[PDB]
Design a protein around this ligand. Structure first.
Ligand SMILES: Nc1nc2c(ncn2[C@@H]2O[C@H](COP(=O)(O)OP(=O)(O)O)[C@@H](OP(=O)(O)OP(=O)(O)O)[C@H]2O)c(=O)[nH]1
Ligand SMILES: [Mg+2]
Ligand SMILES: [Mg+2]
Ligand code: NA
Ligand SMILES: [Zn+2]
Ligand SMILES: [Zn+2]
Lengths: 149, 1330, 49, 73, 50
DNA sequence: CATGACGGCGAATACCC
RNA sequence: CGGAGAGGUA
DNA sequence: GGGTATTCGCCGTGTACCTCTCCT
């Protein structure tokens, strides 16, 4: 029936026609299926999804960057990302992920100033999340502490 | 700043020392204002000023004023951040028990006191009494007195002793127990005890007591008299629309604790009646343990909504806990994300970055460059220029990112290559452009996928991105060493189309000066792309010294192949392109380029291949139409014939000639055959086309059908998909898994009917739900593997070990599952590999087997190579580079500092989602070899087999075995040892329903100790009528027969007994039940006959293997070699005591036994059939045996799905599974006998003792599951961050554990450089300075 | 949605891995231009000060 | 250097050690004011350091020798 | 208007998109004739017949 | 109160001497 | 901005 | 008093991202 309707419109019954390349005018070597398809634009626009952050607001308890495009948050570098960094042996990249790009308050300030100064060097410190963990364990009536140097 | 983390119990004095003040009020803040109430949870004089340098009343508001404690409000002028560091304390009116040290099994209080947890729960929660220091009365020091008996005892005698209830009594009992003398009492009682259950229970308590004795912890500290309070800034109040606050879920528990403490205090001074005071004490106790661990015991205290309140323990455990959500992973700055689109113009090292994303990401760099050239005097000026997006800002952005790599990531990050580095190129729009060739590495496509981008800030991070993570440096899979950047889909289609040949294409027979003339002719339309022509081709070959010698020759090729030759770098033969190039051919070409020329020419070649493939796929005009799905014209008659056949079978069933089950089986077989016929006809018609030759003659050629070209090239599709499109869909399965009788005869071109479509939805839904529910299991297995292997790092170049594992080709019998080449490629030999001369050394002791060495080994017909393994590596705290071998991704020997454990875990985990939860015949020419076999006289002259375990090898002339079969007992070979076989003959036959007791020497069998009617019975089956004898089972028999065991001796005409020569015992055979004596008494039994008849895988399998889970019916093995003595038989379970000093064993009687009562089995021999437990394999046959077993079993599952994973990763996991050892003999070492410790500790202690010349301790290696091994690691930090945080932390606090920051997870948590890769040297410098 | 004149062929990698190549005429004719309405709220409340 | 570090890797012998040496040299050129030993073809300090390493001009021993000479003169 | 990759059809086995495409072409063809008959101002009888 | 999950594992219980 | 519930994308 | 089969309570169950309402 489709081929009959194609015949009625004086169109090839195979549904394939000869196409030419607009760039060169050269004929494409084989017949190309050309027709009409009903296409939908889904509610997944790149306008709503594109997001980037250099610096911004940080969480209250942990000093890590906020989450979500609506909050201008940073991307989460989760456990498997850390596993990938460990498998590469990229220890400095991992350290800057953990400290100067996250809850190392002093480290991130020094990093920003150094980048403005043109000195691409970090001075990482203790992430605040570790201190929060220590305080939480201490609140459970457990004495956890760091030893000497 | 620190080298370790110390954990222990917190004394009340320690808790007070932490605290800065006491919280007495249960209110948080006055919500009319925003001020916190005095002495509340957010009080300012205790925790610190709310504002920076601003005391609460507000007098002192300056940096000058810092350090002065305001005497009006009481708030010290200082940084407000002290509010997240200063802790509070709550003085509890009554002592309270800590739930972690009570409920977390094993109960530390209960084990420390030997009163059961039930009694402690009743007493603490005010349901009973305990007597403390009874004295001269009959009451003990731990006896439970019920409320009804308390006053009865008080009236009987109520003054000389003491009895109490609640947490005060438990604290008194914990404080009135002397640790050391009780340890001595328990240690001596461990000697004078007869119960081995009792000795385990006592040693558990002894181990707990030693924990409290070696550390500074005191038992009474497990009862909380002072309750610490978290700093208020760690428990903030989130404003909702300003006016109102949401439930903090943590301040509420604190409020309840304070309320109940205040009530108990105001009743304590009141001297209220004891019943209500006890009730308030109990309520304060549940308030406290709800604050600590809400829901651990009893009902979970609930907030405003039915959702349980989130306690302090919840803060630190689980997926949302501190460890996994904020320490092992965290949100980062200088990051973004966007939808990915294909960039076909990109070079392998480049990505397409939107310029808006780049402007935001590199913003501080832009500010710095703006300041550098004076365009922005201040920070705000630069910010305004960037916000306005001036032209000079874009020029600066172009300058900054020129060679600053960025990291692109796609979740889930299954392997390290899920994050790769690329040079960004500014593009318009908002979508990130991705290079096609890396998509396979990312498992990325362009149907909605999004990717995250990260900016490496420091020079170290930028250089790590460039040298370690750039896509051009990571073109090989770390799992198997194979390239990852093989072209796919349209690139493969383009290369295949341009390298195809056509019989009568335009320009055929032309002779061309070279590829340039071919390109000129094709572009000018004078020659077809598939024309068979002669082309002068100059190719290059590397000589001995590595120079490219050029040879020019005339090649019979096609125009397209000559055109493609221009992008082939010098050094590759022309034969690599002189063929129709499919996916595998292109991958092989890339492999050859990498092997011959290196990395950079390979990257350039891959990019050129992708460009050419895109261009010529576009030029081909390859399409897809309904006509391309050619349905064979014989399909309808094949379907009609199958329908007639199944109708005939149905008629036979209606006539009773066949039953229902065999009718169903026959119909299924007929429909399967019809599906095969339809598929064959469709493929035959689709794969070939006719064409006019140079002369007017018909010729057959490979079809140019678009669907066939896509499938044959390997770009897209397969045989199954083609037959679903143009053949028939085939047989489908019901939801329960049974195959539907009527298949779907239609294909997708014809279209299904309602019934067929509904039937297919069953399988579609099953597959989709299977993927959805298997991804979680795969992720869990990957995480467990990562933990068990996280700390394993290559720490040495060569440990000097001589031990290794013996690598042979994997052969299951009748096929080569896996060649020796792939199992030794990139390995380091553990010993010398000889030539067949047996004297000339082919491969020395320390060679890294690259491609040339493996070529030499396979050319000299090498059967097995001993190679070093990480399992047998002598290196402590890691492995050496030599035992690990080649770095698969890099292609050379593994460097020091590589985190091979994480690499192995990812390599195994990544294909996890691809996983889906009679008589022998030689089939090829070759000589026959039997091992563990004996030659005996036979009735027909063909040898029987007698050994318990017998295997057959087929060695194909040259000396390499090709097939290996298992020969069960009583299997008579149809040929002899060392006999050539043409191939396809039954080598050996045996009846699976009969288990004989064959005797080597002929003679009359005498029924010794045999009683007729009690242990043997006569039947006469009506079909035969023979007086057959059956031995009644040792339990199923009569009472009288139970006393006597069956026995058959061998006598002959002479009268004496002829027995197995070389032994001292007469030949006696026992038939303990289920045995069929077919022959009569006194009958000559010729050798080679029967005497009695005795009848007779996916991801979860991998997880079970890596968890070392015991099978349901494990195969029983011999603990020590020797003759088996079945002293106890039947009696519920037969007890076999073997004899080498004889040792008894307990075995269920309902299990089949391969061994016989007079069989001398060796250690590790299969006594009974069933899946072998890996623990038994390790215990009896050694570390190498269990390693080989785990490797083979895992690789079976992975090969079934076509997944290629190098064995070394599984060996890394096994080595991590084998870290523990149990002390068998203490010797002179400090280890307690029978305890479990680290195998490396034992190695070091034994080495130092042998250096001193003393005797070292002996040990048994322990095989632990990956979860158990991870939880049993020395570092409590890693175990707590993994799983069971409450239990792990409780163990660490009770034992006063100390964690040296030695592993990867530990250093990640504290934000230090990991002791691997670029940080490794740093840690070395840290270690050598101490 | 919209009726699109579609051709089935590879085009220089721009349709690789389910990617779609769209003519600028589709953009010019506003075939898939869509209207999105966003509601922003400004709330003046009663502060302590 | 830029696309691949194979030459630099084989000069250093260890890829992580190569990263460390290149970082030290790049910090010398970026912050310490040192001058490149190779022509500056619009490369960054990291890539310039990698180019110097792959040509044998810069390694750990050379950097240590130059540091000692700089601080002793 | 849009170029779709043929290679996403065979393994996906969503052949309807091909048939619809063919049918879509046929549909447009009918319109392409009617539009022509409307542009030439043909008789109402001619449009009736077609 | 919710009453649709289940497999693995270790401590406790009971049963059988 | 924390939590809960619901839905969705890969 | 003691060894062993059965029971009961706890532990765990993929990553990243996006939208909405509602919450002392
Ligand atoms: N991936 C890929 N790369 C290509 C291709 N063609 C050329 N390249 C490489 O890209 C690099 C940049 O090219 P240049 O011509 O130097 O560009 P530039 O002006 O931006 O510096 C060159 O390597 P280089 O900077 O000299 O690198 P290296 O040799 O130092 O590693 C070049 O060899 C290709 O098809 N694919
Ligand atoms: Mg996708
Ligand atoms: Mg250049
Ligand atoms: Na170069
Ligand atoms: Zn004040
Ligand atoms: Zn070693």
């Amino acid at each position: 029936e489709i081929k009959e309707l194609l015949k009625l419109g004086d169109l090839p019954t195979s549904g394939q026609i000869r196409l030419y390349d607009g760039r060169t005018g050269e004929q494409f070597e084989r017949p190309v299926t050309v027709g009409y398809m009903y296409m939908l634009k889904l509610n997944h626009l790149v306008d709503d999804k594109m997001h980037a952050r250099s610096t911004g607001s940080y969480s209250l308890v942990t000093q890590q960057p906020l989450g979500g495009k609506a909050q201008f948050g940073g991307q989460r570098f989760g456990e498997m990302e850390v596993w990938a960094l460990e498998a590469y042996g990229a220890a400095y990249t991992l350290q800057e992920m953990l400290t100067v790009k996250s809850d190392d308050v002093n480290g991130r300030t020094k990093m920003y100033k150094n980048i403005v100064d043109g000195n691409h060097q970090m001075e990482p410190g203790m992430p605040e999340s570790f201190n929060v963990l220590l305080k939480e364990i201490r609140s459970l009536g457990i004495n956890i502490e760091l030893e000497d140097e | 700043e620190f080298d370790a983390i110390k954990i222990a119990l917190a004394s009340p004095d320690m808790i007070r020392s932490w605290s800065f003040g006491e919280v007495k009020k249960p209110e948080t803040i006055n919500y009319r204002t925003f001020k916190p109430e005095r002495d509340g949870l957010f009080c300012a004089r205790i925790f610190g000023p709310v504002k920076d340098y601003e005391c609460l009343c507000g007098k002192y508001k300056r940096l000058k004023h810092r350090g002065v404690i305001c005497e009006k409000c009481g708030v010290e002028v200082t940084q407000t951040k002290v509010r997240r560091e200063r802790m509070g304390h709550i003085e509890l009116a009554s002592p309270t028990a800590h739930i972690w040290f009570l409920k977390s099994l094993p109960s530390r209080i209960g084990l420390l006191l030997d009163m059961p947890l039930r009694d402690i729960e009743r007493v603490l929660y005010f349901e009973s009494y305990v007597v403390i220091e009874g004295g001269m009365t009959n009451l003990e020091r731990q006896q439970i007195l019920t409320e009804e008996q308390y006053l009865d005892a008080l009236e009987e005698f109520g003054d000389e002793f003491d009895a109490k209830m609640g947490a005060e009594a438990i604290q008194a009992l914990l404080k009135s127990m002397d640790l050391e003398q009780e340890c001595e009492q328990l240690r001596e009682e461990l000697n004078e005890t007869n119960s081995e259950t009792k000795r385990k229970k006592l040693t558990k308590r002894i181990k707990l007591l030693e924990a409290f004795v070696q550390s500074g912890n005191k038992p009474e500290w497990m009862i909380l008299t002072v309750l610490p309070v978290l700093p208020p800034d760690l428990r903030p109040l989130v404003p909702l629309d300003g006016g109102r606050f949401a439930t903090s879920d943590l301040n509420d528990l604190y409020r309840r604790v304070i309320n109940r403490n205040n009530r108990l205090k105001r009743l304590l001074d009141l001297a209220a009646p004891d019943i209500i005071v006890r009730n308030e004490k109990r309520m304060l106790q549940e308030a406290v343990d709800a604050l600590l661990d809400n829901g651990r015991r009893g009902r979970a205290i609930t907030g405003s909504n039915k959702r349980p309140l989130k306690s302090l323990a919840d803060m630190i455990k689980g997926k949302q806990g501190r460890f996994r959500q904020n320490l092992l992973g965290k949100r980062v700055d200088y990051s973004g994300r966007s939808v990915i689109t294909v960039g076909p113009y990109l070079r392998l090292h480049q990505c397409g970055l939107p310029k808006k994303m780049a402007l935001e990401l590199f913003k501080p760099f832009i500010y710095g460059k703006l300041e550098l050239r004076g365009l922005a005097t201040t920070i705000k000026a630069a910010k305004k220029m960037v916000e306005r997006e001036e032209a000079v800002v874009w020029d600066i952005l172009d300058e900054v990112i020129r060679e600053h790599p960025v990291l692109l990531n796609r979740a889930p990050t299954l392997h390290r290559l899920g994050i790769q580095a690329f040079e960004p190129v500014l593009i318009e729009g908002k979508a990130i452009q991705l290079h096609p060739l890396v998509c396979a590495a990312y498992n990325a496509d362009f149907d909605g996928d999004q990717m995250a981008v990260h900016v490496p800030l420091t020079l170290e991070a930028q250089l790590e991105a460039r040298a370690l993570m750039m896509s051009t440096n990571n073109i090989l899979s770390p799992a198997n060493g194979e390239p990852i950047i093989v072209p796919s889909q349209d690139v493969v289609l383009g290369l295949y189309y341009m390298t195809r040949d056509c019989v009568n294409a335009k320009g055929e027979g032309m002779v061309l000066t070279g590829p340039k003339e071919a390109e000129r002719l094709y572009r000018s339309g004078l020659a077809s792309l598939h024309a068979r022509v002669k082309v002068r081709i100059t190719e290059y070959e590397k000589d001995a010294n590595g120079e490219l010698v050029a040879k020019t020759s005339l090649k019979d090729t096609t125009v397209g192949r000559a055109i493609l030759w221009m992008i082939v770098p010098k050094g590759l033969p022309y034969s690599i392109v002189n063929q129709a190039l499919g996916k595998k051919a292109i991958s092989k070409m890339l492999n050859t380029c990498y092997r011959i020329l290196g990395l950079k020419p390979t990257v350039i070649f891959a990019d050129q291949i992708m460009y050419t493939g895109f261009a010529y796929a576009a030029r081909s005009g390859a399409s897809v139409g309904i006509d391309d799905m050619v349905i064979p014209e014989k399909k309808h008659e094949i379907i009609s014939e199958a329908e007639a056949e199944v109708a005939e079978i149905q008629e036979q069933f209606q006539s009773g000639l066949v039953t229902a089950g065999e009718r169903y089986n026959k119909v299924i077989d007929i429909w399967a055959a019809a599906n095969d016929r339809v598929s064959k006809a469709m493929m035959d018609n689709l794969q070939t086309e006719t064409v006019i030759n140079r002369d007017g003659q018909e010729e057959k050629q490979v079809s140019f059908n678009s669907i066939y070209m896509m499938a044959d090239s390997g770009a897209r599709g397969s045989a199954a998909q083609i037959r679903q499109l143009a053949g028939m869909r085939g047989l489908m399965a019901k939801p329960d898994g049974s195959i539907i009788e009527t298949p779907i005869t239609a294909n997708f071109r014809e279209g299904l009917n309602v019934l067929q479509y509904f039937i297919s939805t069953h399988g579609a839904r099953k597959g989709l739900a299977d993927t959805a529910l298997k991804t979680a299991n795969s992720g869990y297995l990957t995480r467990r593997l990562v933990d068990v292997a996280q700390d394993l790092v290559v720490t040495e170049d060569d440990c000097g070990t001589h031990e290794g594992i013996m690598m042979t080709p994997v052969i299951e019998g009748g096929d080569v599952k896996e060649p020796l080449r792939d199992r030794v490629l990139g390995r380091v030999t553990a010993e010398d590999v000889l030539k067949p001369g047996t004297a000339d050394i082919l491969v020395p002791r320390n060679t890294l087997l690259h491609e040339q060495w493996c070529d030499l080994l396979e050319e000299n017909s090498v059967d097995a190579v001993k190679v070093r393994s990480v399992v047998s590596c002598d290196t402590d705290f890691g492995v050496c580079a030599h035992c690990y071998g080649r770095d698969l991704a890099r292609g050379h020997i593994i460097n020091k500092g590589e985190a091979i454990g994480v690499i192995a875990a990812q390599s195994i985990g990544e294909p996890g989602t691809q996983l889906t939860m009679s008589s022998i015949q030689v089939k090829n020419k070759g000589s026959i070899k039997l091992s563990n076999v004996k030659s005996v006289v036979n009735s027909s002259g063909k040898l029987v087999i007698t050994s318990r375990n017998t295997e057959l090898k087929l060695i194909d002339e040259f000396g390499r075995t090709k097939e290996s079969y298992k020969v069960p007992y009583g299997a008579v070979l149809a040929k002899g040892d060392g006999e050539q076989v043409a191939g396809g003959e039954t080598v050996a036959n045996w009846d699976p329903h009969t288990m004989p007791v064959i005797t080597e020497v002929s003679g009359f069998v005498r029924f010794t100790d045999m009683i007729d009617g009690q242990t043997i019975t006569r039947q006469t089956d009506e079909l035969t009528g023979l007086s057959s004898l059956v031995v009644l089972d040792s339990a199923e028999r009569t009472a009288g027969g139970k006393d006597l065991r069956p026995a058959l001796k061998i006598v002959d005409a002479q009268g004496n007994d002829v027995l197995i020569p070389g032994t001292d015992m007469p030949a006696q055979y026992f038939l303990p039940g289920k045995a069929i004596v077919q022959l009569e008494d006194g009958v000559q039994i010729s050798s080679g006959d029967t005497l009695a008849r005795i009848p007779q895988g996916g991801l979860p399998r991998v997880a079970d293997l890596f968890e070392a889970r015991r099978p349901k019916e494990p195969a029983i093995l011999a603990e020590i070699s020797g003759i088996v003595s079945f002293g106890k038989e039947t009696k519920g379970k037969r007890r076999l005591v073997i004899t080498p000093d004889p040792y008894e064993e307990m075995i269920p009687k309902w299990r089949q036994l391969n061994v016989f009562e007079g069989e001398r089995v060796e250690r590790g021999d299969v006594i009974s059939d069933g899946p072998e437990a890996p623990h038994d394999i390790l215990r009896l046959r050694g570390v190498h045996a269990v390693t080989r077993y785990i490797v083979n079993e895992v690789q079976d599952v992975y090969r079934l799905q076509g997944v290629k994973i190098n064995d070394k990763h599984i060996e890394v996991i096994v080595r991590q599974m084998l870290r523990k050892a149990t002390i068998v003999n203490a010797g002179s070492s400090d280890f307690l006998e029978g305890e479990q410790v680290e195998y490396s500790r034992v190695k070091i202690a034994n080495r130092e003792l042998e250096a001193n010349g003393k005797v070292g301790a002996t040990y048994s290696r322990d095989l632990l599951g990956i979860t158990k091994a991870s939880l049993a690691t020395e570092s409590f930090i890693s175990a707590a961050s993994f799983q069971e945080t409450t239990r792990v932390l409780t163990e660490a606090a009770v034992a006063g554990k100390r964690d040296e920051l030695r592993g990867l997870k530990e250093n990640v948590i504290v934000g230090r450089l990991i002791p691997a890769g670029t940080g490794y040297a740093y840690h070395q410098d840290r270690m050598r300075r101490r | 949605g919209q009726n699109m004149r579609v051709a089935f062929m590879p085009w220089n990698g721009y349709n690789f891995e389910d990617s779609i190549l769209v003519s600028e005429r589709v953009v010019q004719e506003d075939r898939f231009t869509t209207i999105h309405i966003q509601e922003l709220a400004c709330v003046s409340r009663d502060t302590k000060l | 250097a830029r696309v691949t570090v194979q030459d630099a890797v084989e000069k250093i012998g260890n890829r992580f050690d190569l990263v460390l040496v290149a970082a030290r040299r790049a910090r010398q050129m970026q912050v310490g004011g040192k001058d490149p030993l190779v022509p500056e073809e619009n490369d960054k300090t990291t890539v310039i350091a990698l180019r110097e390493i792959e040509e044998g001009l810069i390694n750990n021993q050379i950097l240590d020798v130059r540091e000692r000479q700089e601080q002793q003169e | 208007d849009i170029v779709l990759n043929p290679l996403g059809v065979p393994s996906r086995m969503n052949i309807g998109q091909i048939l619809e495409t063919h049918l879509g072409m046929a549909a447009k063809g009918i319109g392409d004739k009617i539009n022509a008959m409307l542009k030439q101002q043909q008789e109402v009888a001619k449009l009736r017949e077609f």
